[PDB]
Design a protein around this ligand. Structure first.
Ligand code: CLA
Ligand code: CLA
Ligand code: CLA
Ligand code: CLA
Ligand code: CLA
Ligand code: CLA
Ligand code: CLA
Ligand code: CLA
Ligand SMILES: C=Cc1c(C)c2cc3nc(c4c5[nH]c(cc6nc(cc1[nH]2)C(C)=C6CC)c(C)c5C(=O)[C@@H]4C(=O)OC)[C@@H](CCC(=O)OC/C=C(\C)CCC[C@H](C)CCC[C@H](C)CCCC(C)C)[C@@H]3C
Ligand SMILES: CC1=C(/C=C/C(C)=C\C=C\C(C)=C\C=C\C=C(C)\C=C\C=C(C)\C=C\C2=C(C)C(=O)CCC2(C)C)C(C)(C)C[C@H](O)C1
Ligand SMILES: [Fe+2]
Lengths: 28, 31, 44, 27, 68, 278, 289, 40
């Protein structure tokens, strides 16, 4: 349903963008 | 007649280019 | 009504903790370990 | 050098004709 | 509204803590005090974030009527 | 019906591409860093093709090439077959989706026959070419830079420009772009309103358009035909290299230092490019 | 004489002329004639200033694909080389002056074709977006035929008027400039791809209905034009020794050794193209009899 | 707040970014840069 249709994309995207945000700092 | 929202979005997309050019110029001037 | 309140509460619990979970996952030595990606020190 | 002169007059007359016609556009 | 304000404040607090940790202990590292080191301060900031969320949410659960 | 047969597969392909572009590495498959984690940027990141250590094995998760492990399954490069196969499955699913939408509405399916071109392009470039090749290590990577590297490799090893099929595909692509631009421009010019444009082209281009349906068919048909011929040419390259090489000019130029043709210089570039990688 | 001008500006002629056509037709006809003659029977045009003449004419042993109107000589450089500056016809033929004449008269002709298009469009009572669309191929042709030779400082490295010449020019361009990594060729690629996509979709929609459209057609026609404008500007920038992104050796390790990315492989391929052989210390035969 | 101009949702997100996200990010980066020791 619409609930899954939105959450299946939303719930990993925030995780991934937080990951990339941290990688933007982990670089020496 | 008033502007259309597509015009506003296109204006933002166009304005993306001077932002990138300005970033490049500033980084060049930093050296 | 109360439904919107619960919607806001549910969307406030999860988003910050998810972002911070991602940040913690890649900040510690977990991203390299799980995915097999080598850390920059080991490179030869 | 005669070819140079011929080309000069040809191109000059062509451009002069074009500009003269454009300035007196009938329609 | 109180919950949202508290969550925003705790988020900004964690950002400030992380920035302080990044800029303070980036030189030589010692283990005499485990709080005054880059990894220790980063762990402190992460735990501080999660504790802030927990405390704000438990306070909201106590104050807010019903909603269950 | 089939509209739910592609959504999970397409979403899984997208998720696999996103996971590969930021976490997995190509150190044990190409000796390169190809994700954000190592320090690569948007243009550099790529889901690299599998290494040349297995051949045509698909590197399944439950297959013995990884034995259920995930770190190994990512290091062996099974993410490339995962992404490519799921993407192809979802793409044929959308083919059937357009088919069934047309069936439900009751009009002739023309979006499907047009979309067939991308299907052929994908199945030829990413699946059939490596099948005709030694293994997946020569298959193109899922990256902006990987695509360019694959293009240059095919130029070096096949002289793909000289192939008639890529030539006619280039013609089809450029004709499609020209027809798109000209149709949009003429519509916003007359903004029926066809007689004005028809007279304008009859007096400008001489050979004007008979009807707007004819022009719409032509802009539908030129790029799809170009893509189909390009895919057929790649498939031929897999089986039988269809490059008309004028060996007469080659011999004429080999021992005559006073003769040269741009074909000879293209051959020089190709053979030097071959010799460059030993 | 007024009858002649009345016919010229007449919107009733079988093939329209207009006042721009009065200058378009001679230039286009001249360009076609001299291009055909140069394609058929031009002598071997030396192109690099060394003892390696290059032949691009059919009568000199070339087929249709291999035929190409050879660019000018490196001896010419960027200098204007008309026939009267040639002490005789043979030197002008052997120095690639036909190429310069063709390109100059053809550029004038396409500009006048634009003018004729606009003139007919306004005389017919229509807002002229057709020339706004037609400007993109003209801009690309000018960038790749006039701007690039000037930026590179010579007419020798211009695109030959031939199928094989086009491929050689493109490959040498990629080797010397890395156009693929430059964002503006990607903008052009996206423009042409979107043009093809919109063509296919719009044709399918119209034919499936055979028995927002305004802005739809507007953006449909506008995307490829903008893409072509951007790629022409990119080529013009590349003319003055500007190149695409160089992400090579941009990732190191804890010690300082390069890790390598796909951009590094692209750079290696470009270097391989720009020298059509191997590198040093690859065991040349030491002793020869 | 809302208005009758086209794309009325743009201020809703653009203004908070230019008011909170952008200032926070730039001050964070500037504080990090002005404090990096060595390499004077
Ligand atoms: C539309 C639904 C759909 C379809 C058609 C496929 C089809 C496929 N999947 Mg798949 N998959 C799906 C949903 C789907 N999957 C979902 C929802 C998940 C999440 C649990 C997965 C997780 C998954 C994994 C982890 C792998 C596959 C693989 C495969 C391929 C080989 C497996 C096979 O067919 O049996 C035989 C095949 C093309 C394998 C693959 O791509 O190997 C090449 C593989 O390793 N799938
Ligand atoms: C200066 C303008 C110009 C012209 C006339 C051509 C013409 C041609 N190009 Mg070309 N090209 C150009 C610029 C030009 N190109 C530029 C700037 C680039 C990028 C650097 C390329 C890159 C390119 C590639 C990569 C390829 C071609 C190919 C071709 C040929 C067929 C494809 C085609 O045009 O169909 C699209 C256009 C149309 C369908 C519109 C109609 C055009 C007519 C049919 C072409 C005939 C014109 C002819 C040259 C006129 C000569 C004089 C006349 C008296 C005979 C054709 C001879 C292909 C090829 O080699 O095939 C032989 C091919 O693979 N071109
Ligand atoms: C102006 C010049 C020009 C143009 C217009 C084209 C046009 C084309 N080339 Mg090409 N090429 C050129 C120059 C050019 N080439 C040069 C100079 C080289 C170096 C030799 C190559 C090397 C090259 C290779 C190696 C290949 C092509 C392919 C293609 C076709 C693929 C289109 C595509 O990506 O679909 C857009 C992408 C998709 C539809 C993928 C599906 C996306 C889904 C919808 C998501 C297309 C007809 C490919 C081909 O034959 O296609 C089958 C191919 O394999 N070209
Ligand atoms: C609309 C008409 C027209 C225009 C604008 C041009 C324009 C041009 N021609 Mg040209 N030409 C034309 C018709 C035209 N041509 C026709 C019909 C013929 C056949 C006789 C020629 C034969 C011709 C030759 C043989 C040569 C030119 C050359 C030139 C260039 C130098 C201009 C010049 O001589 O000095 C302009 C005047 C002054 C500076 C004063 C210029 C781009 C020359 C060239 O290409 O140089 C590289 C050259 O050698 N033309
Ligand atoms: C799975 C198939 C697939 C997908 C999703 C894409 C997607 C993309 N390609 Mg692409 N491409 C493909 C297959 C594919 N390509 C193939 C088979 C070839 C031939 C080898 C190319 C050759 C190609 C070139 C030459 C370029 C792209 C570019 C692009 C990007 C611009 C958007 C676009 O294509 O126009 C909508 C986009 C991300 C452009 C780019 O770099 O943009 C970032 C670009 O310049 N592609
Ligand atoms: C998927 C692969 C792909 C694709 C789709 C493209 C696509 C493109 N490339 Mg590209 N390229 C690629 C791979 C690819 N490239 C690779 C791998 C390389 C490395 C070798 C290059 C190297 C490269 C170079 C070096 C250049 C391009 C250019 C272009 C653009 C062509 C613009 C053009 O023809 O001018 C528009 C069309 C014309 C100018 C034709 C003339 C039109 C006039 C107005 C009419 C002429 C009529 C004719 C003379 C006679 C009429 C016919 C009839 C009536 C008789 C286009 C966006 C060119 C560019 O950016 O353009 C500026 C360019 O210079 N590419
Ligand atoms: C310097 C010129 C300038 C200025 C002072 C403003 C001022 C404003 N714009 Mg605006 N805007 C501009 C140019 C400008 N605009 C341009 C060129 C565009 C087209 C892309 C827009 C598009 C735009 C939109 C779509 C919206 C605004 C909105 C607003 C208001 C919210 C605050 C804001 O700027 O953040 C939002 C504005 C932006 C993110 C615009 C980007 C900044 C522009 C493109 C360049 C500015 C660079 C500048 C010279 C840097 C100087 C540095 C200096 C301080 C040291 C504010 C009144 C919002 C509004 O009206 O709310 C009611 C809104 O929704 N603007
Ligand atoms: C830069 C632009 C900017 C923007 C867009 C806002 C926006 C806002 N401010 Mg504000 N503020 C700003 C600058 C800004 N501030 C500055 C520079 C100062 C220093 C003087 C303040 C000091 C200030 C105070 C002291 C207070 C606000 C409050 C508020 C909120 C009141 C709206 C409402 O109905 O409350 C309810 C709004 C919501 C429930 C939506 C919450 C949305 C996000 C998640 C909140 C984070 C609103 C979100 C009030 C507040 O905290 O309200 C919560 C409040 O008491 N502001
Ligand atoms: C330039 C590249 C290009 C892209 C990106 C593209 C994309 C799209 N076109 C579609 C439609 C169409 N395309 C058409 C004609 C054309 N389309 C073309 C070229 C493209 N078309 C060309 C050249 C033509 C002319 C023949 C038609 C006629 C249609 C439609 O009817 C349809 C539409 O309505 O559009 C609005 C949609 C396909 C939906 C689908 O199959 O769901 C399934 C989605 C899947 C399976 C996900 C794709 C995953 C892929 C296969 C593998 C993964 C790829 C990575 C994630 C990305 C890698 C990136 C690297 C290159 C760096 C989508 C918006
Ligand atoms: C008790 C104690 C100590 C002593 C403290 C004493 C005596 C006083 C301290 C007072 C303090 C710290 C007061 C702090 C006030 C903070 C304010 C006023 C914050 C306001 C925030 C607002 C209004 C935020 C608004 C917004 C948020 C949250 C956003 O994210 C953006 C939007 C917006 C701007 C609206 C010390 C000795 C310092 C340390 C010891 O451990 C504990
Ligand atoms: Fe239409």
């Amino acid at each position: 349903v619409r609930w899954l249709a939105v959450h299946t994309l939303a719930v990993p995207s925030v995780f991934f963008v937080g990951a990339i945000a941290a990688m933007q700092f982990i670089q020496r | 007649m008033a502007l259309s929202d597509t015009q506003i979005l296109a204006a933002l997309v166009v304005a993306l280019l001077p932002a990138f050019l300005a970033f490049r110029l500033s980084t060049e001037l930093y050296k | 009504i109360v439904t919107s309140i619960r919607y806001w509460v549910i969307h406030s619990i999860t988003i910050p903790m998810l972002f911070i979970a991602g940040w913690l996952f890649v900040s510690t030595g977990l991203a390299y370990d799980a995915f097999g990606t080598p850390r920059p020190d080991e490179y030869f | 050098l005669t070819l140079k002169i011929a080309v000069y007059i040809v191109v000059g007359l062509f451009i002069s004709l074009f500009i003269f016609g454009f300035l007196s556009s009938d329609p | 509204g109180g919950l949202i304000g508290a969550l925003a404040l705790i988020l900004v607090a964690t950002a400030a803590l992380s920035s302080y940790g990044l800029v303070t202990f980036q030189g030589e590292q010692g283990s005499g005090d485990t709080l005054q080191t880059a990894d220790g301060w980063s762990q402190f900031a992460a735990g501080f974030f999660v504790g802030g969320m927990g405390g704000a949410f438990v306070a909201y659960f106590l104050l807010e009527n019903l909603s269950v | 019906w089939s509209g739910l047969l592609l959504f999970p597969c397409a979403f899984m392909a997208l998720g696999g591409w996103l996971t590969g572009t930021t976490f997995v590495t190509s150190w044990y498959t190409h000796g390169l860093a190809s994700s954000y984690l190592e320090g690569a940027n948007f243009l550099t990141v790529a889901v690299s093709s599998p290494a040349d250590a297995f051949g045509h094995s698909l590197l399944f998760l439950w297959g013995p090439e990884a034995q259920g492990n995930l770190t190994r399954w990512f290091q062996i490069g099974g993410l490339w077959p995962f992404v490519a196969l799921h993407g192809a499955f979802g793409l044929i699913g959308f083919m059937l989706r357009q088919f069934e939408i047309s069936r439900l509405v009751g009009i002739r399916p023309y979006n499907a026959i047009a979309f067939s071109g991308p299907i052929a392009v994908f199945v030829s470039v990413f699946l059939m070419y490596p099948l005709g090749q030694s293994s997946w290590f020569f298959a193109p990577s899922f990256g902006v830079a990987g695509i360019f590297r694959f293009i240059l490799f095919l130029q070096g090893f096949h002289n793909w420009t000289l192939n008639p099929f890529h030539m006619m595909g280039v013609a089809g692509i450029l004709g499609g772009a020209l027809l798109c631009a000209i149709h949009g421009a003429t519509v916003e010019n007359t903004l029926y309103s066809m007689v004005t444009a028809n007279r304008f082209w009859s007096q400008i281009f001489g050979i004007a358009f008979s009807n707007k349906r004819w022009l719409h068919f032509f802009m539908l048909f030129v790029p799809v035909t170009g893509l189909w011929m390009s895919s057929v040419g790649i498939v031929g390259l897999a089986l039988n290299l269809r490059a008309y090489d004028f060996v007469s000019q080659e011999l004429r130029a080999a021992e005559d230092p006073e003769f040269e043709t741009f074909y000879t210089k293209n051959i020089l570039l190709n053979e030097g490019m071959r010799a460059w990688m030993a | 004489w007024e009858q002649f001008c009345q016919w010229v500006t007449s919107t009733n002629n079988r093939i329209y002329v207009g006042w721009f056509g009065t200058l378009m037709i001679p230039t286009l006809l001249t360009a076609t004639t001299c291009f055909i003659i140069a394609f058929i029977a031009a002598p071997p045009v030396d192109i690099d200033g060394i003892r390696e003449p290059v032949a691009g004419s059919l009568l000199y042993g070339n087929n249709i694909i291999s035929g190409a109107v050879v660019p000018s000589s490196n001896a010419i450089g960027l200098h204007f080389y008309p026939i009267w500056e040639a002490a005789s016809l043979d030197e002008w033929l052997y120095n690639g002056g036909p190429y310069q004449l063709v390109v100059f008269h053809f550029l004038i002709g396409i500009f006048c074709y634009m003018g004729r298009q606009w003139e007919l469009s306004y005389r017919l009572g229509m807002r002229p977006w057709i020339c706004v669309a037609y400007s993109a191929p003209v801009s690309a042709a000018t960038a790749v035929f006039l701007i690039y030779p000037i930026g590179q400082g010579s007419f020798s490295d211009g695109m030959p008027l031939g199928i094989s010449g086009t491929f050689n020019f493109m490959i040498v361009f990629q080797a010397e400039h890395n156009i693929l990594m430059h964002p503006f060729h990607m903008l052009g690629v996206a423009g042409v791809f979107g043009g093809s996509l919109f063509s296919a979709m719009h044709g399918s929609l119209v034919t499936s209905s055979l028995v927002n459209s305004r802005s739809l057609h507007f953006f449909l026609g506008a995307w490829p034009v903008i893409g072509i404008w951007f790629t022409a500007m990119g080529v013009s920038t590349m003319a003055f020794n500007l190149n695409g992104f160089n992400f090579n050796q941009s990732i190191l390790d804890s010690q300082g050794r390069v890790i390598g990315t796909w951009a590094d492989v692209l750079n290696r391929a470009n270097i391989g193209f720009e020298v059509m052989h191997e590198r040093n210390a690859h065991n040349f035969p030491l002793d020869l009899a | 707040m809302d208005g009758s101009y086209a794309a009325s949702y743009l201020p809703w997100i653009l203004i908070p970014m230019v008011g909170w996200l952008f200032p926070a990010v730039t001050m964070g980066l500037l504080f990090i840069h002005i404090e990096s020791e060595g390499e004077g």
